[PDB]
């Protein structure tokens, strides 16, 4: 079940969602209008893991999402995502995704979320 | 929690979300009822006025103080929502209940639609996160 969290974590309205896909594996951040991505290649992902000392990034990100231990700085076309909890905080550089590439992802994101909600409410009612 | 469903039903990737708004409980701000349909590119709405909602309710024999949200909710749970899309217009048919209810929807203008779609996306993600937390609890622990 694909991990995600929203920011800010307060009772205030959510402004950003952080999620990941498919260990083409990447981290994403969106305010539902623009999309930022780690834009990994198979090579630069391996480079990244080795620098931090790795297995898989997803479980750490999942754990951060549950603890709401995700920090986000955003400037211009630049964002960073920080995961806290592990033996070392992990920071990721993200870049803005051009509109034409971002649009189908944002579209599928919205439709998939809606389908999850419907499914989770279905399952939660049977509990 | 606010009702919704996705279409088409079953295992195939969702193409549309249907949801509703208004008829809020309590003595606080209460908005008029509307049904929404989106493919996450465009937004369609019933765009009800007080008169057009009354006329719709008459067309299918409902009273004025009657909330329509619970009929929508039943339709969503059973996935008895049928959608037709013309170029400009849409229809939504709810068959959760004993009598079918048909709704005319029209396109919401971009400057109103775009902030509604963003809030929808962000709100759903908050829900998902909240639901999976409540689920992990109930099912095992």
PDB file of N, CA and C in Angstrom, chain A residues 1-2 4-12 14-17 30-33 65-66 68 106-118 120-124 127, chain B residues 1-2 4-6 8 10-17 38-41 73 76-77 79 117-118 120-129 131-135 138-139:
ATOM      1  N   UNK A   1       0.839  -1.198   0.000  1.00  0.00           N
ATOM      2  CA  UNK A   1       0.000   0.000   0.000  1.00  0.00           C
ATOM      3  C   UNK A   1       0.876   1.251   0.000  1.00  0.00           C
ATOM      4  N   UNK A   2       0.789   2.066  -1.072  1.00  0.00           N
ATOM      5  CA  UNK A   2       1.759   3.136  -1.371  1.00  0.00           C
ATOM      6  C   UNK A   2       1.802   4.226  -0.303  1.00  0.00           C
ATOM      7  N   UNK A   4       2.276   7.686   1.773  1.00  0.00           N
ATOM      8  CA  UNK A   4       2.152   9.112   1.508  1.00  0.00           C
ATOM      9  C   UNK A   4       1.894   9.853   2.812  1.00  0.00           C
ATOM     10  N   UNK A   5       2.116  11.159   2.795  1.00  0.00           N
ATOM     11  CA  UNK A   5       1.699  12.001   3.896  1.00  0.00           C
ATOM     12  C   UNK A   5       1.404  13.386   3.351  1.00  0.00           C
ATOM     13  N   UNK A   6       0.762  14.214   4.169  1.00  0.00           N
ATOM     14  CA  UNK A   6       0.431  15.572   3.774  1.00  0.00           C
ATOM     15  C   UNK A   6       1.062  16.562   4.722  1.00  0.00           C
ATOM     16  N   UNK A   7       1.291  17.765   4.214  1.00  0.00           N
ATOM     17  CA  UNK A   7       1.896  18.831   4.986  1.00  0.00           C
ATOM     18  C   UNK A   7       1.089  20.103   4.767  1.00  0.00           C
ATOM     19  N   UNK A   8       0.934  20.921   5.819  1.00  0.00           N
ATOM     20  CA  UNK A   8       1.470  20.699   7.168  1.00  0.00           C
ATOM     21  C   UNK A   8       0.718  19.595   7.906  1.00  0.00           C
ATOM     22  N   UNK A   9       1.346  19.004   8.938  1.00  0.00           N
ATOM     23  CA  UNK A   9       0.730  17.915   9.703  1.00  0.00           C
ATOM     24  C   UNK A   9      -0.336  18.408  10.677  1.00  0.00           C
ATOM     25  N   UNK A  10      -0.487  19.725  10.790  1.00  0.00           N
ATOM     26  CA  UNK A  10      -1.436  20.300  11.728  1.00  0.00           C
ATOM     27  C   UNK A  10      -2.885  20.058  11.350  1.00  0.00           C
ATOM     28  N   UNK A  11      -3.815  20.578  12.163  1.00  0.00           N
ATOM     29  CA  UNK A  11      -5.241  20.524  11.822  1.00  0.00           C
ATOM     30  C   UNK A  11      -5.569  21.484  10.680  1.00  0.00           C
ATOM     31  N   UNK A  12      -4.627  22.376  10.386  1.00  0.00           N
ATOM     32  CA  UNK A  12      -4.742  23.292   9.261  1.00  0.00           C
ATOM     33  C   UNK A  12      -4.850  22.513   7.944  1.00  0.00           C
ATOM     34  N   UNK A  14      -4.292  20.846   4.400  1.00  0.00           N
ATOM     35  CA  UNK A  14      -3.067  20.301   3.795  1.00  0.00           C
ATOM     36  C   UNK A  14      -2.650  21.112   2.573  1.00  0.00           C
ATOM     37  N   UNK A  15      -1.358  21.382   2.429  1.00  0.00           N
ATOM     38  CA  UNK A  15      -0.870  22.176   1.304  1.00  0.00           C
ATOM     39  C   UNK A  15      -0.046  21.351   0.349  1.00  0.00           C
ATOM     40  N   UNK A  16       0.541  20.271   0.849  1.00  0.00           N
ATOM     41  CA  UNK A  16       1.382  19.415   0.019  1.00  0.00           C
ATOM     42  C   UNK A  16       1.174  17.937   0.299  1.00  0.00           C
ATOM     43  N   UNK A  17       1.273  17.117  -0.744  1.00  0.00           N
ATOM     44  CA  UNK A  17       1.346  15.675  -0.531  1.00  0.00           C
ATOM     45  C   UNK A  17       2.699  15.156  -1.012  1.00  0.00           C
ATOM     46  N   UNK A  30       3.839  17.373  -4.411  1.00  0.00           N
ATOM     47  CA  UNK A  30       2.974  18.275  -5.167  1.00  0.00           C
ATOM     48  C   UNK A  30       2.070  19.133  -4.271  1.00  0.00           C
ATOM     49  N   UNK A  31       1.734  20.333  -4.742  1.00  0.00           N
ATOM     50  CA  UNK A  31       0.691  21.138  -4.097  1.00  0.00           C
ATOM     51  C   UNK A  31      -0.609  21.007  -4.887  1.00  0.00           C
ATOM     52  N   UNK A  32      -0.652  19.962  -5.715  1.00  0.00           N
ATOM     53  CA  UNK A  32      -1.763  19.625  -6.603  1.00  0.00           C
ATOM     54  C   UNK A  32      -1.842  20.555  -7.810  1.00  0.00           C
ATOM     55  N   UNK A  33      -0.859  21.435  -7.964  1.00  0.00           N
ATOM     56  CA  UNK A  33      -0.788  22.246  -9.176  1.00  0.00           C
ATOM     57  C   UNK A  33       0.543  22.014  -9.869  1.00  0.00           C
ATOM     58  N   UNK A  65       6.472   8.687   6.879  1.00  0.00           N
ATOM     59  CA  UNK A  65       5.119   9.139   6.570  1.00  0.00           C
ATOM     60  C   UNK A  65       4.180   8.878   7.730  1.00  0.00           C
ATOM     61  N   UNK A  66       4.398   7.758   8.404  1.00  0.00           N
ATOM     62  CA  UNK A  66       3.579   7.380   9.544  1.00  0.00           C
ATOM     63  C   UNK A  66       3.909   8.250  10.752  1.00  0.00           C
ATOM     64  N   UNK A  68       5.014  11.184  10.571  1.00  0.00           N
ATOM     65  CA  UNK A  68       4.981  12.570  10.103  1.00  0.00           C
ATOM     66  C   UNK A  68       6.328  13.234  10.374  1.00  0.00           C
ATOM     67  N   UNK A 106      -0.438  13.930 -12.125  1.00  0.00           N
ATOM     68  CA  UNK A 106      -1.378  14.590 -11.207  1.00  0.00           C
ATOM     69  C   UNK A 106      -2.803  14.046 -11.360  1.00  0.00           C
ATOM     70  N   UNK A 107      -3.176  13.771 -12.602  1.00  0.00           N
ATOM     71  CA  UNK A 107      -4.476  13.236 -12.961  1.00  0.00           C
ATOM     72  C   UNK A 107      -4.649  11.848 -12.346  1.00  0.00           C
ATOM     73  N   UNK A 108      -3.673  10.963 -12.569  1.00  0.00           N
ATOM     74  CA  UNK A 108      -3.727   9.606 -12.022  1.00  0.00           C
ATOM     75  C   UNK A 108      -3.641   9.619 -10.497  1.00  0.00           C
ATOM     76  N   UNK A 109      -2.894  10.569  -9.954  1.00  0.00           N
ATOM     77  CA  UNK A 109      -2.790  10.734  -8.512  1.00  0.00           C
ATOM     78  C   UNK A 109      -4.177  10.986  -7.916  1.00  0.00           C
ATOM     79  N   UNK A 110      -4.878  11.970  -8.457  1.00  0.00           N
ATOM     80  CA  UNK A 110      -6.210  12.306  -7.980  1.00  0.00           C
ATOM     81  C   UNK A 110      -7.180  11.140  -8.095  1.00  0.00           C
ATOM     82  N   UNK A 111      -7.199  10.478  -9.244  1.00  0.00           N
ATOM     83  CA  UNK A 111      -8.169   9.419  -9.460  1.00  0.00           C
ATOM     84  C   UNK A 111      -7.857   8.210  -8.574  1.00  0.00           C
ATOM     85  N   UNK A 112      -6.572   7.925  -8.392  1.00  0.00           N
ATOM     86  CA  UNK A 112      -6.146   6.805  -7.570  1.00  0.00           C
ATOM     87  C   UNK A 112      -6.419   7.028  -6.089  1.00  0.00           C
ATOM     88  N   UNK A 113      -6.199   8.247  -5.610  1.00  0.00           N
ATOM     89  CA  UNK A 113      -6.557   8.601  -4.240  1.00  0.00           C
ATOM     90  C   UNK A 113      -8.037   8.375  -3.957  1.00  0.00           C
ATOM     91  N   UNK A 114      -8.881   8.791  -4.897  1.00  0.00           N
ATOM     92  CA  UNK A 114     -10.309   8.685  -4.729  1.00  0.00           C
ATOM     93  C   UNK A 114     -10.709   7.224  -4.624  1.00  0.00           C
ATOM     94  N   UNK A 115     -10.076   6.386  -5.436  1.00  0.00           N
ATOM     95  CA  UNK A 115     -10.375   4.972  -5.434  1.00  0.00           C
ATOM     96  C   UNK A 115      -9.908   4.293  -4.134  1.00  0.00           C
ATOM     97  N   UNK A 116      -8.778   4.743  -3.605  1.00  0.00           N
ATOM     98  CA  UNK A 116      -8.279   4.259  -2.325  1.00  0.00           C
ATOM     99  C   UNK A 116      -9.213   4.606  -1.179  1.00  0.00           C
ATOM    100  N   UNK A 117      -9.604   5.873  -1.109  1.00  0.00           N
ATOM    101  CA  UNK A 117     -10.564   6.315  -0.103  1.00  0.00           C
ATOM    102  C   UNK A 117     -11.799   5.426  -0.112  1.00  0.00           C
ATOM    103  N   UNK A 118     -12.399   5.246  -1.293  1.00  0.00           N
ATOM    104  CA  UNK A 118     -13.592   4.408  -1.426  1.00  0.00           C
ATOM    105  C   UNK A 118     -13.323   2.996  -0.905  1.00  0.00           C
ATOM    106  N   UNK A 120     -10.785   1.955   1.260  1.00  0.00           N
ATOM    107  CA  UNK A 120     -10.458   1.976   2.678  1.00  0.00           C
ATOM    108  C   UNK A 120     -11.699   2.172   3.547  1.00  0.00           C
ATOM    109  N   UNK A 121     -12.637   2.990   3.084  1.00  0.00           N
ATOM    110  CA  UNK A 121     -13.853   3.215   3.850  1.00  0.00           C
ATOM    111  C   UNK A 121     -14.678   1.945   3.814  1.00  0.00           C
ATOM    112  N   UNK A 122     -14.606   1.256   2.690  1.00  0.00           N
ATOM    113  CA  UNK A 122     -15.290   0.008   2.536  1.00  0.00           C
ATOM    114  C   UNK A 122     -14.744  -0.981   3.535  1.00  0.00           C
ATOM    115  N   UNK A 123     -13.433  -1.043   3.654  1.00  0.00           N
ATOM    116  CA  UNK A 123     -12.804  -2.036   4.521  1.00  0.00           C
ATOM    117  C   UNK A 123     -12.948  -1.653   5.989  1.00  0.00           C
ATOM    118  N   UNK A 124     -12.833  -0.361   6.275  1.00  0.00           N
ATOM    119  CA  UNK A 124     -12.925   0.123   7.647  1.00  0.00           C
ATOM    120  C   UNK A 124     -14.316  -0.089   8.238  1.00  0.00           C
ATOM    121  N   UNK A 127     -15.121  -3.476  10.343  1.00  0.00           N
ATOM    122  CA  UNK A 127     -14.168  -3.574  11.440  1.00  0.00           C
ATOM    123  C   UNK A 127     -14.814  -3.106  12.737  1.00  0.00           C
TER     124      UNK A 127
ATOM    125  N   UNK B   1     -18.194  10.404   6.936  1.00  0.00           N
ATOM    126  CA  UNK B   1     -17.229  10.995   6.008  1.00  0.00           C
ATOM    127  C   UNK B   1     -17.838  11.136   4.618  1.00  0.00           C
ATOM    128  N   UNK B   2     -17.524  12.244   3.915  1.00  0.00           N
ATOM    129  CA  UNK B   2     -18.200  12.614   2.658  1.00  0.00           C
ATOM    130  C   UNK B   2     -18.137  11.521   1.591  1.00  0.00           C
ATOM    131  N   UNK B   4     -18.209   9.257  -1.851  1.00  0.00           N
ATOM    132  CA  UNK B   4     -17.704   9.335  -3.209  1.00  0.00           C
ATOM    133  C   UNK B   4     -17.640   7.953  -3.801  1.00  0.00           C
ATOM    134  N   UNK B   5     -17.408   7.909  -5.101  1.00  0.00           N
ATOM    135  CA  UNK B   5     -17.123   6.666  -5.777  1.00  0.00           C
ATOM    136  C   UNK B   5     -16.333   7.015  -7.009  1.00  0.00           C
ATOM    137  N   UNK B   6     -15.721   5.999  -7.597  1.00  0.00           N
ATOM    138  CA  UNK B   6     -14.987   6.166  -8.836  1.00  0.00           C
ATOM    139  C   UNK B   6     -15.606   5.308  -9.919  1.00  0.00           C
ATOM    140  N   UNK B   8     -14.734   3.647 -13.991  1.00  0.00           N
ATOM    141  CA  UNK B   8     -15.696   2.541 -13.919  1.00  0.00           C
ATOM    142  C   UNK B   8     -15.458   1.689 -12.689  1.00  0.00           C
ATOM    143  N   UNK B  10     -14.971  -1.827 -10.449  1.00  0.00           N
ATOM    144  CA  UNK B  10     -14.145  -2.989 -10.713  1.00  0.00           C
ATOM    145  C   UNK B  10     -12.672  -2.645 -10.772  1.00  0.00           C
ATOM    146  N   UNK B  11     -11.863  -3.566 -11.331  1.00  0.00           N
ATOM    147  CA  UNK B  11     -10.392  -3.587 -11.284  1.00  0.00           C
ATOM    148  C   UNK B  11      -9.690  -2.570 -12.186  1.00  0.00           C
ATOM    149  N   UNK B  12     -10.376  -2.098 -13.222  1.00  0.00           N
ATOM    150  CA  UNK B  12      -9.787  -1.166 -14.178  1.00  0.00           C
ATOM    151  C   UNK B  12      -9.496   0.207 -13.565  1.00  0.00           C
ATOM    152  N   UNK B  13      -8.421   0.861 -14.035  1.00  0.00           N
ATOM    153  CA  UNK B  13      -8.022   2.202 -13.590  1.00  0.00           C
ATOM    154  C   UNK B  13      -9.170   3.208 -13.621  1.00  0.00           C
ATOM    155  N   UNK B  14      -9.346   3.954 -12.530  1.00  0.00           N
ATOM    156  CA  UNK B  14     -10.466   4.895 -12.450  1.00  0.00           C
ATOM    157  C   UNK B  14     -10.311   6.027 -13.468  1.00  0.00           C
ATOM    158  N   UNK B  15     -11.420   6.435 -14.071  1.00  0.00           N
ATOM    159  CA  UNK B  15     -11.417   7.553 -15.002  1.00  0.00           C
ATOM    160  C   UNK B  15     -12.177   8.779 -14.463  1.00  0.00           C
ATOM    161  N   UNK B  16     -13.132   8.559 -13.562  1.00  0.00           N
ATOM    162  CA  UNK B  16     -13.920   9.642 -12.986  1.00  0.00           C
ATOM    163  C   UNK B  16     -14.113   9.447 -11.497  1.00  0.00           C
ATOM    164  N   UNK B  17     -14.199  10.561 -10.787  1.00  0.00           N
ATOM    165  CA  UNK B  17     -14.633  10.598  -9.400  1.00  0.00           C
ATOM    166  C   UNK B  17     -15.963  11.333  -9.312  1.00  0.00           C
ATOM    167  N   UNK B  38     -15.607  14.601 -11.830  1.00  0.00           N
ATOM    168  CA  UNK B  38     -14.376  15.040 -12.445  1.00  0.00           C
ATOM    169  C   UNK B  38     -13.553  13.877 -13.014  1.00  0.00           C
ATOM    170  N   UNK B  39     -12.815  14.155 -14.085  1.00  0.00           N
ATOM    171  CA  UNK B  39     -11.824  13.211 -14.607  1.00  0.00           C
ATOM    172  C   UNK B  39     -10.428  13.690 -14.226  1.00  0.00           C
ATOM    173  N   UNK B  40     -10.384  14.640 -13.284  1.00  0.00           N
ATOM    174  CA  UNK B  40      -9.147  15.277 -12.794  1.00  0.00           C
ATOM    175  C   UNK B  40      -8.527  16.190 -13.836  1.00  0.00           C
ATOM    176  N   UNK B  41      -9.228  16.401 -14.951  1.00  0.00           N
ATOM    177  CA  UNK B  41      -8.844  17.457 -15.900  1.00  0.00           C
ATOM    178  C   UNK B  41      -9.902  18.546 -15.917  1.00  0.00           C
ATOM    179  N   UNK B  73     -25.029   8.632  -1.083  1.00  0.00           N
ATOM    180  CA  UNK B  73     -24.141   7.772  -0.311  1.00  0.00           C
ATOM    181  C   UNK B  73     -24.459   6.302  -0.552  1.00  0.00           C
ATOM    182  N   UNK B  76     -23.245   5.295  -3.964  1.00  0.00           N
ATOM    183  CA  UNK B  76     -21.781   5.138  -3.957  1.00  0.00           C
ATOM    184  C   UNK B  76     -21.336   3.810  -3.348  1.00  0.00           C
ATOM    185  N   UNK B  77     -21.953   3.436  -2.232  1.00  0.00           N
ATOM    186  CA  UNK B  77     -21.611   2.187  -1.564  1.00  0.00           C
ATOM    187  C   UNK B  77     -21.878   0.986  -2.470  1.00  0.00           C
ATOM    188  N   UNK B  79     -22.126   1.138  -5.685  1.00  0.00           N
ATOM    189  CA  UNK B  79     -21.677   1.482  -7.027  1.00  0.00           C
ATOM    190  C   UNK B  79     -22.831   1.343  -8.020  1.00  0.00           C
ATOM    191  N   UNK B 117     -10.416  21.397  -7.762  1.00  0.00           N
ATOM    192  CA  UNK B 117      -9.668  20.174  -8.014  1.00  0.00           C
ATOM    193  C   UNK B 117      -8.426  20.064  -7.119  1.00  0.00           C
ATOM    194  N   UNK B 118      -7.739  21.178  -6.884  1.00  0.00           N
ATOM    195  CA  UNK B 118      -6.553  21.124  -6.008  1.00  0.00           C
ATOM    196  C   UNK B 118      -6.952  20.731  -4.591  1.00  0.00           C
ATOM    197  N   UNK B 120      -9.607  19.142  -3.668  1.00  0.00           N
ATOM    198  CA  UNK B 120     -10.043  17.740  -3.724  1.00  0.00           C
ATOM    199  C   UNK B 120      -8.858  16.760  -3.601  1.00  0.00           C
ATOM    200  N   UNK B 121      -7.829  16.975  -4.408  1.00  0.00           N
ATOM    201  CA  UNK B 121      -6.629  16.145  -4.368  1.00  0.00           C
ATOM    202  C   UNK B 121      -5.979  16.142  -2.978  1.00  0.00           C
ATOM    203  N   UNK B 122      -5.779  17.330  -2.433  1.00  0.00           N
ATOM    204  CA  UNK B 122      -5.121  17.445  -1.139  1.00  0.00           C
ATOM    205  C   UNK B 122      -5.993  16.830  -0.032  1.00  0.00           C
ATOM    206  N   UNK B 123      -7.298  17.093  -0.081  1.00  0.00           N
ATOM    207  CA  UNK B 123      -8.239  16.533   0.876  1.00  0.00           C
ATOM    208  C   UNK B 123      -8.315  15.014   0.851  1.00  0.00           C
ATOM    209  N   UNK B 124      -8.260  14.428  -0.341  1.00  0.00           N
ATOM    210  CA  UNK B 124      -8.297  12.971  -0.485  1.00  0.00           C
ATOM    211  C   UNK B 124      -7.061  12.345   0.143  1.00  0.00           C
ATOM    212  N   UNK B 125      -5.910  12.965  -0.089  1.00  0.00           N
ATOM    213  CA  UNK B 125      -4.645  12.455   0.421  1.00  0.00           C
ATOM    214  C   UNK B 125      -4.621  12.488   1.932  1.00  0.00           C
ATOM    215  N   UNK B 126      -5.135  13.567   2.506  1.00  0.00           N
ATOM    216  CA  UNK B 126      -5.331  13.631   3.943  1.00  0.00           C
ATOM    217  C   UNK B 126      -6.240  12.480   4.419  1.00  0.00           C
ATOM    218  N   UNK B 127      -7.362  12.255   3.729  1.00  0.00           N
ATOM    219  CA  UNK B 127      -8.297  11.155   4.065  1.00  0.00           C
ATOM    220  C   UNK B 127      -7.639   9.780   4.020  1.00  0.00           C
ATOM    221  N   UNK B 128      -6.959   9.500   2.910  1.00  0.00           N
ATOM    222  CA  UNK B 128      -6.252   8.243   2.739  1.00  0.00           C
ATOM    223  C   UNK B 128      -5.318   8.004   3.917  1.00  0.00           C
ATOM    224  N   UNK B 129      -4.503   9.010   4.221  1.00  0.00           N
ATOM    225  CA  UNK B 129      -3.548   8.912   5.317  1.00  0.00           C
ATOM    226  C   UNK B 129      -4.274   8.654   6.633  1.00  0.00           C
ATOM    227  N   UNK B 131      -7.389   7.407   7.007  1.00  0.00           N
ATOM    228  CA  UNK B 131      -8.084   6.121   6.941  1.00  0.00           C
ATOM    229  C   UNK B 131      -7.158   4.939   7.201  1.00  0.00           C
ATOM    230  N   UNK B 132      -5.997   4.936   6.558  1.00  0.00           N
ATOM    231  CA  UNK B 132      -5.081   3.812   6.693  1.00  0.00           C
ATOM    232  C   UNK B 132      -4.537   3.723   8.112  1.00  0.00           C
ATOM    233  N   UNK B 133      -4.477   4.868   8.780  1.00  0.00           N
ATOM    234  CA  UNK B 133      -4.106   4.913  10.184  1.00  0.00           C
ATOM    235  C   UNK B 133      -5.208   4.290  11.042  1.00  0.00           C
ATOM    236  N   UNK B 134      -6.452   4.687  10.794  1.00  0.00           N
ATOM    237  CA  UNK B 134      -7.587   4.121  11.518  1.00  0.00           C
ATOM    238  C   UNK B 134      -7.767   2.637  11.211  1.00  0.00           C
ATOM    239  N   UNK B 135      -7.380   2.228  10.007  1.00  0.00           N
ATOM    240  CA  UNK B 135      -7.533   0.837   9.599  1.00  0.00           C
ATOM    241  C   UNK B 135      -6.524  -0.078  10.280  1.00  0.00           C
ATOM    242  N   UNK B 138      -7.815  -0.770  13.827  1.00  0.00           N
ATOM    243  CA  UNK B 138      -8.997  -1.614  13.992  1.00  0.00           C
ATOM    244  C   UNK B 138      -8.775  -3.084  13.628  1.00  0.00           C
ATOM    245  N   UNK B 139      -8.125  -3.329  12.492  1.00  0.00           N
ATOM    246  CA  UNK B 139      -8.050  -4.679  11.931  1.00  0.00           C
ATOM    247  C   UNK B 139      -7.189  -5.647  12.749  1.00  0.00           C
TER     248      UNK B 139
END
